[PDB]
Amino acid sequence: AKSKNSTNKNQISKSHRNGIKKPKDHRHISTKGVNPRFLRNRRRAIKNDPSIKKSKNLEKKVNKE
Amino acid sequence: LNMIKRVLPFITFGYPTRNTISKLIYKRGFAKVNGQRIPLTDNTIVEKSLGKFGITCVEDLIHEITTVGPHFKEANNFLWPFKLDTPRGGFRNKRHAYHQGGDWGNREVYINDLVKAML
Amino acid sequence: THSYGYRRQTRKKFAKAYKTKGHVRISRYLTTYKVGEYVDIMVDGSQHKGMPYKLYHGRTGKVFNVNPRSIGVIVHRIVNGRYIEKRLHVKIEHVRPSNVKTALSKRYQANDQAKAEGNKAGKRVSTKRNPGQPLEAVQVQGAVNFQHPKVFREIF
Amino acid sequence: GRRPARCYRQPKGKPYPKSRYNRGVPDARIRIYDSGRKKATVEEFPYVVHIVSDEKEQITSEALEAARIAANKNLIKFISKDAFHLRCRVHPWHVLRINKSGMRGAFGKALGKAARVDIGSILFSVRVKEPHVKYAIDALTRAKAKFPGRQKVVTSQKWGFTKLTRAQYSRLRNQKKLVTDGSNVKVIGERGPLSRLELFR
Amino acid sequence: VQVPKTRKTYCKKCNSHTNHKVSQYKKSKESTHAQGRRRYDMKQSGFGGQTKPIFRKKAKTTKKVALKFDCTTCKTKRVIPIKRCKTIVFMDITQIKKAKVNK
RNA sequence: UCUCAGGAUAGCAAGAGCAAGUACGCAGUUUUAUUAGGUAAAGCGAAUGAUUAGAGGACUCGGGGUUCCAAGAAUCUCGACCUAUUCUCAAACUUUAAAUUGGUAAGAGCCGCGGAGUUUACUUAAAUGAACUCUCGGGAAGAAUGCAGUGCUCUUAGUGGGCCAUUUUUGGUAAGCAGAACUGGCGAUGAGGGAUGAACCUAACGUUGAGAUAAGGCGCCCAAAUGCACGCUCAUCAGAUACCAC
RNA sequence: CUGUUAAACCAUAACGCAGGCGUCCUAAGUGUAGCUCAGUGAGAACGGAAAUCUCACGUAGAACAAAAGGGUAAAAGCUACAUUGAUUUUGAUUUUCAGUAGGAAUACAAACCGCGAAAGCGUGGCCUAUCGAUCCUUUAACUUUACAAGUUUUAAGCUAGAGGUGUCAGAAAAGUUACCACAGGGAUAACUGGCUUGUGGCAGCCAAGAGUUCAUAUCGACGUUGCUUUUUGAUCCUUCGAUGUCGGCUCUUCCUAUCAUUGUGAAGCAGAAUUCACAACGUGUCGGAUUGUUCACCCGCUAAUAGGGAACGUGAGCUGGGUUUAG
RNA sequence: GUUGUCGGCCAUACUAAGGUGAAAACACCGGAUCCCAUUCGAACUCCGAAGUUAAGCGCCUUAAGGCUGGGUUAGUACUAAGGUGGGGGACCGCUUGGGAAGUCCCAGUGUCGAUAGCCU
Ligand SMILES: [Mg+2]
Ligand SMILES: [Mg+2]
Ligand SMILES: [Mg+2]
Ligand SMILES: [Mg+2]
Ligand SMILES: [Mg+2]
Ligand SMILES: [Mg+2]
Ligand SMILES: [Mg+2]
Ligand SMILES: [Mg+2]
Ligand SMILES: [Mg+2]
Ligand SMILES: [Mg+2]
Ligand SMILES: [Mg+2]
Ligand SMILES: [Mg+2]
Ligand SMILES: [Mg+2]
Ligand SMILES: [Mg+2]
Ligand SMILES: [Mg+2]
Ligand SMILES: [Mg+2]
Ligand SMILES: [Mg+2]
Ligand SMILES: [Mg+2]
Ligand SMILES: [Mg+2]
Ligand SMILES: [Mg+2]
Ligand SMILES: [Mg+2]
Ligand SMILES: [Mg+2]
Ligand SMILES: [Mg+2]
Ligand SMILES: [Mg+2]
Ligand SMILES: [Mg+2]
Ligand SMILES: [Mg+2]
Ligand SMILES: [Mg+2]
Ligand SMILES: [Mg+2]
Ligand SMILES: [Mg+2]
Ligand SMILES: [Mg+2]
Ligand SMILES: [Mg+2]
Ligand SMILES: [Mg+2]
Ligand SMILES: [Mg+2]
Ligand SMILES: [Mg+2]
Ligand SMILES: [Mg+2]
Ligand SMILES: [Mg+2]
Ligand SMILES: [Zn+2]
C-alpha cells in the first residue's frame, strides 16, 4: 500500500464553489455568554416598564404591584 | 485603474478619441433593455431607459461618455459590452506587453489604431 | 504538524514586544467598554488567564456581553467555505478598543454639520468621498535638469 | 572513497551548520585561513588581489584547502613569504550528508563541510606591493583551477584589506587621521569624547 | 502522595465547613445476588464454554484515588477523585507539622 | 472506524420547493478608513550561538621560557580581561524589517456626556451608572465597478488509489523517485499549433456559408514571400531555437 | 506536548530535524508580608581553587518538579507564616471538529470558605502535554419501583465518582505448512525493459611532485569537469485469466573504450624489445586441467590468445549440471 | 519660574564624571519612654527639631555611551503579476506594481496631568 497523506488541493475551490455563506444579521441576538445578574435586571426592568406592552393577565399582575 | 493591475496581461486598454467613441457606438452600438440585447437604431430607446437622466440621443450618450459627466454609469450600463471583430492588423505578440512590442497593457493613445483594425 | 495544543506555534506571536517585559499597562485596566463597541483583540504573554486561542489575536470583534474581569466579544471564522460565529470571552488584558467606529462617528458628525448648514442655504452638500482622480491640466515653468544614461563602472 | 564534488555542487538544501542539533559532524580539511607575513602594516601591503566566485555554489572545505595550499606554495616560492598576506575570506559552515534497507528514512549522517558561496562573494584575498601584483594574480588564477566551475580574479583599488580607496587612504595619511592596527585601519571622527584625542595627553 | 487525615471542607448537610476524616476508597465485593452475577452464572451454565470475554491486555500502572470524607458533625459521606498516583500515605496533622518543623 | 482494495461522515452534484429575492443588498474586485503579522532581506564594532586576522593596554589574572645577578628586579612567550578593530555564518538566532497577504468597517437598525420612563440583593456616596421604551436636534442617500450566480428548505446519486504544469518547497548523489503549498490543468476534452505524442502554446465544441485572426508558419512535401532590407557564419564531425531529448 | 520543515493570520506531507509525555507535588496548591537572585571588582584569624563575613556594581545573564518554547524583579524568583478554593451546585465558551464525544483550559451566576488592614486573589500546579464509552460492579446522595394489600429481608432504579480498554472512538485470542487451498492484486516482491549513476567502469582540467638534470617522453598528489550502462544500488512505470527464471553448446550480426594484422605521429626510440598517440574492425582472436558455473586459477600453442551489445542474443534449437515442489 | 502628593504614557526619562541650589516643601539630621521592629532602633515603627545642601532631589554641563527621529545606504536586497525571454545549467535579465535594514551623517534628549502650595 502507498497513499497520498494530506493534500488540500481541490478543497479551497470546492469551498468557493457556491460562495462563502454568511449568517443573517438578526436585530435580536441570543443570550449566550451574558451573565445572569444583567439578565435578571433585564427581566425585572421589562416586567415593570409600562411603555412595554405585556399580555393581559401580565398587566393585571404588574398593575396589582 | 487598480482593478486593472490583475488583468493587464489578458487585456489592452487605452485612451480613446471622441471620434473612436462615436464610431464604436454607431457600428457596434447595442443597448441593454430589460435584459435584452437591442441594436442601437432609434433614439426612442435612449429615451426609454435614459431619457429622464436627460439622454435623448446617441450624440448625447457619446457626450456624457467623452466628458464623463454627471451620469456616466447608466450611460455605460446602457451600452452592451462591445463584441468586436478580428483585428485586420495582426496583434503583435500576445505574450508581450505593448511596451516590448507586445499587446498587453495600456496603449495610451494607441488603442484607437486597434479599434480601427477591429471595427 | 504532529502536535496540536492550545499554544502550538505560539512562540513569536505571544512573546512580549521588545522591552515590554513586565509592563503592567494600567491604561487597559481603565478602559471602559460597552455592549455595542467594536474591540480589537491582542494577547499579552504575562497574563495567562482569559487567553484567547492564537487564531483570534489581532482580530476585530464586536462586544456582546460585559463581565466583571472580561469582555464577551463576537468574531467569525471561515470553516469549510462557510462563516461560523464564535462567542469569545476575553480577560481585560488581551483587549483594546478599535478605532474603526471612532473614525466613523467623528467623520459623520462633521459631515452632517456641513449638510445642515448647506440645507440652510439651499445648497445640497454631498458627503460622498471620491477616490484619486485624473490630474487636471497644468502649466509648468521650471528649471530643466537634463539627464543622460550613465556609463557602466565596476566598484570593487 | 569520497563522493564526487558534482554531487553537492548545487545548494539544494537549507543550511546545516554544526549545531547542538548536529552530532558527530567531522572537521573541515581547511584549518588555517592566513598565510604569509601576517604581521605587516597597512602601509607595507597596499594592493589587493581577490578571487571572486562568479557562480552560486557549494565549495568543499577540502577543495578550499586545495586551492589555498596551491596559491601559498606558488606565492612563497615565486616572491617571498615576507611579501604576501594571503587570507581565505570564506569559511565552510554547511554540513553535507550522505545516506549510506532501501529508503525507509533517508536522513544521512554527516559527510563533510562545505562553504556556501553566492555569486560575487570574495573567496580569496591577497595583499602585496606593486612589483608583485602580477605574481599574485598569477597564483590566484591557478588556485581558481582547484575550484568548481567559474571564479574570476580581480584587482581592488582599495587599500590592502581596508575599506578605504587608496586616495581616501592617502588623504587620511596626510591629515594624520589614520590609526594603524595590522591589516586594519581606524579613522578618527568628530564624534569622539575629547579625553581620547591625542592633544589632551 | 501525602494526604492529611483531618481536613476542613464543605459539608452539604451542615452547609458550612466541617472537619472530615479523610480515608481512601475501598471497592467492596460483588454481592452474589446482583443481576449481573446472576446472568453471568446462568449463561455460563451448561455448555458454550466461556461466554463473556476475559480482559487480557491491561495498560495502566496507576489508579485514580478516591478520597472518602466523613463529616464529624453530621456523619455525612462524600467521594472525590484525585490524580493518578503510585504511592499514597495518609498522615495525622500532628505528625505533619512535626515533620515540617524538623525539616 | 482490526481502519490502508471497504464503510460511514462532512464537502462536491441533481431535482422538488419555501421566502417580501430589505438592493440603504450582494462580491475569490478595487478604493477609503481603522488594524494585525515576524516570514524574504538585512543584521551580528546588538542579544543567543558559532568564528578567523593583527595591535595596543596606566591598571590586570596565571603559566613558561630569558637574563642577570641574584629570588628580586629587568626581560622574551602564552593565553585570559578590557582597549580600538577584523574574516565568514545560522530552519530549530535576532534588534530592524518588506512584497504578497489577514481582521473589522464605509449611515435610517446613523450621529449627539438634551429629555421623560422602566428595573422587588443590577451599579454607584450619589437619578450616580448601565440596558431597554417613548421623545428632542441634525442627517441628498454618504467610494469606484459589476449583478443574464437572492437567501433558505427538503430528498437524494456518485466520490472517498489520483496525476501533471508554472512558481515555492523537504528527503535524497539522483530518478519519468518519495513528499508538501497557491492557482490551473489532465482525469471527465475535442479543434489548430510543438512532425509525433494525457496535463505545453492558442484557444472550449449545437448543424452551415462568408470574413478577419490567435498559436504557429509562408523553398518543396504544405495553405502563404525562393519578399524587401540589416549584421554574423564555411564545419575532411556546420547550423537550424520554448516545455524537448541533454 | 514543545521548537523547527511551514515560506510574517490560520492550515499544510513524508519510518523529515531536535526532543518530550502515561508520572510528580498537603505544597511544588492558595494567600499575606518582607527580601533580590546569577555574576564581577576590592577587603577579613585557621582559610589553601573552592566554606563563611563586607562593601560597591550588578536588565535578570539565577530561579521557577519535570521537553521545548513563551512568561515573571518591591515577583511568578528567595525567606517566613497561614490556610485547604486540589471544595458545593449547574450551564456556557475556546482548541481538534461530523463544528459528535472525549482531553484540556477559560469566562459567568449562584454558594461555603482561606489569606490580607484593605482593594484584591484563590473551581489546583506560571502558560502550552501528563489522559478512557455501552454492559457490569462498587460507592455517595434521594418520601423512585417489586403492578391483589401490607411489614420485613432481599432485589431492582434516578444523579454522580472509582474499577478500562496504551490497537488509547474502547474484539475475550499461539504457531506451522516444501502436502497445501480459494478470491484477487501488476494498488506489491522475484526476470527483461524504462528513469537515475551514488557504487562500478572509462576519460579529461590545474599542476605539487616522480622522472639522477628537467612539471607535462611516461605518470600525476591536493582539488576539480565529464562520460558510460557488460557492475552493484535505488525506484516500482509495463507484464501476477504467466513475456519459461543460471550456464554451456550452436549461429548471425553490431559496437570500438583496437589484442593482433595495415599506414603513420611520439619517446628517458642505438639495435632488439617496449611504451604513448592517430586513420582504422577490413580480417582474425585457438586446444585442456578443477569448477553447474559467469568469473577465477593453472597447463599450452599463437600474429594475437582484445572488451562489449543484440529481452544479462539464442529452451515450440538442444542440454538440464546449478537454482526452486513432493522422498 | 519652583515644591511636595497621587499619576497616564514608560530612556527624548537610562548610564558616567561634573557645575549650580531664592523661597517654600522634600530630604539628610536628633532620640529610643510609647504602638512596632530586628543578630543588631541599619531597616521597619514611634517621638521629635540642635545642625545641613554634604547626600537624595530640581536645573544645566560634555566635538559624552545609550536611547528617540530624520539623512545616506538605495530605487541597492527582497517581492506582486507576464513571459514560445537569455543560458548546458547554476542563474541572469525584459514589461507592468510594491519596496527594506547596518557602517557613516545630522538633529533631539522627557512629555501630558489632577491637588495643594512657594516665588509678598
Ligand atoms: Mg460552499
Ligand atoms: Mg503572429
Ligand atoms: Mg502562459
Ligand atoms: Mg510580536
Ligand atoms: Mg480494483
Ligand atoms: Mg454523503
Ligand atoms: Mg433547480
Ligand atoms: Mg449601488
Ligand atoms: Mg484576495
Ligand atoms: Mg505593523
Ligand atoms: Mg515570476
Ligand atoms: Mg511526485
Ligand atoms: Mg502560481
Ligand atoms: Mg496559470
Ligand atoms: Mg477514473
Ligand atoms: Mg484541453
Ligand atoms: Mg470558415
Ligand atoms: Mg533570397
Ligand atoms: Mg489536519
Ligand atoms: Mg521518545
Ligand atoms: Mg509578595
Ligand atoms: Mg488530532
Ligand atoms: Mg470568586
Ligand atoms: Mg470510567
Ligand atoms: Mg565514479
Ligand atoms: Mg585523482
Ligand atoms: Mg520490477
Ligand atoms: Mg505463453
Ligand atoms: Mg516467447
Ligand atoms: Mg579510436
Ligand atoms: Mg592515459
Ligand atoms: Mg571443455
Ligand atoms: Mg538470457
Ligand atoms: Mg526436496
Ligand atoms: Mg538610529
Ligand atoms: Mg546592500
Ligand atoms: Zn457536616
UniProtKB/Swiss-Prot annotation, chain A:
Instruction: Report biased composition (Basic and acidic residues) as residue ranges.
Output: 46-65
Q: Which GO terms describe its biological process?
A: cytoplasmic translation
A single GO molecular-function term is: structural constituent of ribosome
Which InterPro entries does this entry report, sorted A to Z?
Answer: Ribosomal_eL29 (IPR002673)
List the record's Gene Ontology CC terms alphabetically: cytosolic large ribosomal subunit
Q: Which domain of life is it from?
A: Eukaryota
Keyword set, alphabetical order: Cytoplasm, Ribonucleoprotein, Ribosomal protein
Q: Where is the composition biased (Basic residues)?
A: 14-30
Q: What spans are recorded as compositionally biased (Polar residues)? A: 1-13
Q: Where is this region: Disordered?
A: 1-65
Q: Where in the cell is it found?
A: Cytoplasm
| Similarity comment text for this entry | Belongs to the eukaryotic ribosomal protein eL29 family.
Protein name from the UniProt record: Large ribosomal subunit protein eL29
- Organism this protein belongs to: Tetrahymena thermophila
UniProtKB/Swiss-Prot annotation, chain B:
Identify the stretch annotated as signal peptide in this record.
Answer: none
The similarity annotation says:
Belongs to the universal ribosomal protein uL30 family.
Designated name of the protein: Large ribosomal subunit protein uL30
Which species? Tetrahymena thermophila
Name of the encoding gene: RPL7
Swiss-Prot record, chain C:
- SUPFAM superfamilies in the cross-refs: Translation proteins SH3-like domain (SSF50104)
Q: A GO BP term, please?
A: translation
Annotated region Disordered: the residues are 109-131
Q: Which GO terms describe its molecular function?
A: structural constituent of ribosome
Q: Which GO terms describe its cellular component?
A: ribonucleoprotein complex; ribosome
Claim: Cytoplasm is one of the keywords in the record: no
Has keyword Ribonucleoprotein?
Answer: yes
Give a single Pfam family match.
Ribosomal_L21e
Q: Which family does it belong to?
A: Belongs to the eukaryotic ribosomal protein eL21 family.
What name does the UniProt record give this protein?
Large ribosomal subunit protein eL21
Name the species this protein comes from: Tetrahymena thermophila (strain SB210)
Swiss-Prot record, chain D:
Tell me the disulfide pairings in this chain.
none
What is the organism of origin for this protein?
Tetrahymena thermophila (strain SB210)
Which keywords describe this protein according to UniProt?
Ribonucleoprotein, Ribosomal protein
Q: State the InterPro entries in the record.
A: Ribosomal_uL16, Ribosomal_uL16_CS_euk_arc, Ribosomal_uL16_dom, Ribosomal_uL16_euk_arch, Ribosomal_uL16_sf
What Pfam families does this protein's entry cite? Ribosomal_L16
Q: What is this protein called?
A: Large ribosomal subunit protein uL16
Write the lineage as a comma-separated list: Eukaryota, Sar, Alveolata, Ciliophora, Intramacronucleata
Does Glycoprotein show up as a keyword for this record?
no
Q: Which family is this sequence assigned to?
A: Belongs to the universal ribosomal protein uL16 family.
Q: Tell me where on the tree of life, at the top rank, the source sits.
A: Eukaryota
The gene designation is: RPL10
- Leader sequence range is none
Map out region (Disordered) in residue numbers.
1-21
Would you tell me the Gene Ontology cellular component terms? ribonucleoprotein complex; ribosome
List where the protein spans the membrane: none
The answer, when asked if Ribosomal protein is one of the entry's keywords, is yes
According to its UniProt entry, the protein's GO biological process terms are: translation
Q: Name one GO molecular function term.
A: structural constituent of ribosome
